[PDB]
Design a protein around this ligand. Structure first.
Ligand code: T9F
Ligand code: CL
Ligand code: CL
Ligand code: CL
Length: 163
């Protein structure tokens, strides 16, 4: 584990991460997809061999020795708020299991279901809180990746609030 496990946030492409493994914001069919998923496909295409996995699950595939954790958050266009909420919480629990299993000291993680799977709603706080609930019991350095200037500020505030 990390000597003093931390949370950090950076505003940049997760494909350029400086961590021991990456979480993909995957689709259930292991398709190239859009957003983080598309960047992950361009950087680690080998990781998409048999990556298909059901909603609320995570499946790790190695690109070389570099672990890609395909986490499938729900598309809130398809789920009810209640059921989507359950599946989003579950995807993050499965990420925490996989990060523990791999024995990595760091992980790069996007906010699941905050892009084209958000159903046109701001789910920053909902997604980040499910991330904290899953990852708080792990000793991995967590680095959250985002693209929006205002989201970087709000994620940074939420991290600092608890320190
Ligand atoms: C209209 O509902 C939404 C949908 C998406 C967003 C985001 C803004 C910045 N990038 C992350 C996702 C915010 C509100
Ligand atoms: Cl970038
Ligand atoms: Cl998304
Ligand atoms: Cl963002």
């Amino acid at each position: 584990g990390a000597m003093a496990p931390s949370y950090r946030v950076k505003r940049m492409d997760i494909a350029k991460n400086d961590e021991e493994c990456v979480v993909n914001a995957a689709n259930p069919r292991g398709l190239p997809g859009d957003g983080v998923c598309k960047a992950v496909y361009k950087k680690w295409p080998e990781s998409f061999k048999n990556s298909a996995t059901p909603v609320g699950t995570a499946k790790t595939v190695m690109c070389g020795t570099y672990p890609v954790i395909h986490a499938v958050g729900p598309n809130f266009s398809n789920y009810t708020e209640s059921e989507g909420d359950r599946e989003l919480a579950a995807a993050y629990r499965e990420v925490a299991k996989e990060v523990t299993r791999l024995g990595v000291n760091s992980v790069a993680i996007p906010l699941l279901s905050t892009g084209v799977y958000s159903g046109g709603k701001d789910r920053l706080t909902q997604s980040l809180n499910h991330l904290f609930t899953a990852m708080d019991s792990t000793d991995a350095d967590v680095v959250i990746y985002c693209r929006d200037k205002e989201w970087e500020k709000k994620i940074s505030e939420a991290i600092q609030m608890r320190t």
